[PDB]
Ligand binder design. Sequence first.
Ligand SMILES: CNC(=O)c1cc(C2CC2)cc([N+](=O)[O-])c1N[C@@H]1CCCC[C@@H]1NC(=O)c1cc(=O)[nH]c2ccccc12
Ligand SMILES: CNC(=O)c1cc(C2CC2)cc([N+](=O)[O-])c1N[C@@H]1CCCC[C@@H]1NC(=O)c1cc(=O)[nH]c2ccccc12
Lengths: 301, 302
Amino acid sequence: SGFRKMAFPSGKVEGCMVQVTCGTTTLNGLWLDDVVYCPRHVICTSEDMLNPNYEDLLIRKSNHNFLVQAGNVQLRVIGHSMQNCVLKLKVDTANPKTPKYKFVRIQPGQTFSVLACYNGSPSGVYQCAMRPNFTIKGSFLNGSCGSVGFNIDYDCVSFCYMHHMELPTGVHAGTDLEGNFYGPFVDRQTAQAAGTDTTITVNVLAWLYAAVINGDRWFLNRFTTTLNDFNLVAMKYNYEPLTQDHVDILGPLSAQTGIAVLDMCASLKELLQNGMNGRTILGSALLEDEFTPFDVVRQCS
Amino acid sequence: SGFRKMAFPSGKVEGCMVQVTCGTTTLNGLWLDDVVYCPRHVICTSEDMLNPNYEDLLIRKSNHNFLVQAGNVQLRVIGHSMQNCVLKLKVDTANPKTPKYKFVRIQPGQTFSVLACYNGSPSGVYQCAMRPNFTIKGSFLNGSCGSVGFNIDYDCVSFCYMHHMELPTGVHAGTDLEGNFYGPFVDRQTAQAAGTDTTITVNVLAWLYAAVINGDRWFLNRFTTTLNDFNLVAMKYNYEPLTQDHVDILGPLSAQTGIAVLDMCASLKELLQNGMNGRTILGSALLEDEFTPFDVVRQCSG
Ligand SMILES: CNC(=O)c1cc(C2CC2)cc([N+](=O)[O-])c1N[C@@H]1CCCC[C@@H]1NC(=O)c1cc(=O)[nH]c2ccccc12
Ligand SMILES: CNC(=O)c1cc(C2CC2)cc([N+](=O)[O-])c1N[C@@H]1CCCC[C@@H]1NC(=O)c1cc(=O)[nH]c2ccccc12
């Protein structure tokens, strides 16, 4: 028993991280097959980032302007292209540690593991969630760009995130592995603000089902409510409105515990309107919302 | 910026995880060079765990009775031996994915990453700390035995923990890679208590420094305190007494933020007496004690 913020093993992703240098700028790259993926702003200087013309800057670059290295050995760039905000560097050698992989664009509320890297070497792994405002609460320093987020399905590595920038609020924005930014953010060094963030309601409920499955049940009351009554109280606390799909996703967790979903919302509505009164759930004095329903089942069984 | 409970990269440890089966019991093993390390209770049935005689049970076992499987390759056992509470199975070939490694016994209050494994396959990685009562608050199910905890200095893996059992209170206990249990626990399925736990004080202060590094500074007050006055508050709230060694180890973090150590103790002293007043520190409503001073510096400098 027990419940930890658990991240996927990072072994299959470690074998793909390289170091990409263009001029004086260095970041991390993703070496899949004979292509290296990296944030396109690697071709920009500090003065370029204030208003970059990526199409004009990239065309003035040749294959020898990029220094790619996996560990110590070098990789010869034989071609370069751009796809949205991700640079694609063609190399002469295919990565012998390329795993079965996919490029997915996840939805807000989904979770993934992050492998924080610097200069092509991993620094640590942790679990993240795509916030409703299309940001992530990560742990990134200078040189962390190019780090990727991922999930593991059996033997397949689903790449869903590539790190690009830190907003002034301390949160982080990035793209999928096709270059399309999550949210309305751009890769320009101009003032950008993440929208009003909300709480992933279906993840809070799944975390409450995890506490029951682990024996924490002091919060279960004896009342019930409706989706209309709950969402009315949910909106005042900046909680995402609960839809019927969310009720269905909580289905399997409700079956194993024998606690109805609308019953669990009433306990949450009471936990919101009355606070936690200093008590703890699964070792937390707040309401945790970075566990999807699928993560709860995958960890408890 | 930001601050997450970050675990070490687990690639080097993944290549050493194999499956060990003895009859119907299956658990995980650590394959380093030509030796597979696993908990010795894999040789026990459910009836033997009530009062096992491991020497007698091991004598009735032969090399071919140990089924060691590494993914899809089946390893050939050429010998077996017992060291304390771990079984050492010598296999046919040396593990080609063996990293540079060491066997270390960690102290209470220190941290490490756990690679949870089932049937020899890695399931996930998370960071945790050895509690002062020599237990860990982990996440383990049936079949998780054999999973290991580790640290990475540079390229060398410091194995420090191997999982063995879950206690009645829901916490977990295990041994080092030499078979010596952390704590007063024996590998027999009879009631065992972990004893009273405490809160790792130096870790909380290091976490407070991590909050100031990341722009979280509302808890800084206009008060200071002495080492003795702080420990009176600490013993009241079941915190480990702060020593001079703890003050010295916090030096580097005190220099990076400009906050004196005794000033930070004053801010922690106020938080212990008054609470948080409905606010958060690094996204937490509790005082976190699973970050050592070295964990903060490693994460905040990369
Ligand atoms: C610090 N500001 C930014 O990171 C940033 C901000 C904006 C807009 C809000 C103004 C836009 C971009 N942009 O368009 O790329 C930004 N990206 C810069 C410029 C390009 C090259 C990567 C670099 N970022 C980092 O190296 C970095 C990433 C991170 O997660 N955390 C850090 C912590 C400490 C120092 C640096 C970073
Ligand atoms: C549940 N009790 C124990 O785990 C346990 C307790 C004691 C004493 C305090 C009473 C001693 C041992 N022992 O000597 O091995 C124990 N170990 C058992 C018996 C041997 C074979 C491994 C097995 N462990 C697990 O399958 C298991 C490990 C875990 O982390 N969490 C689980 C969650 C749910 C069900 C099982 C487990």
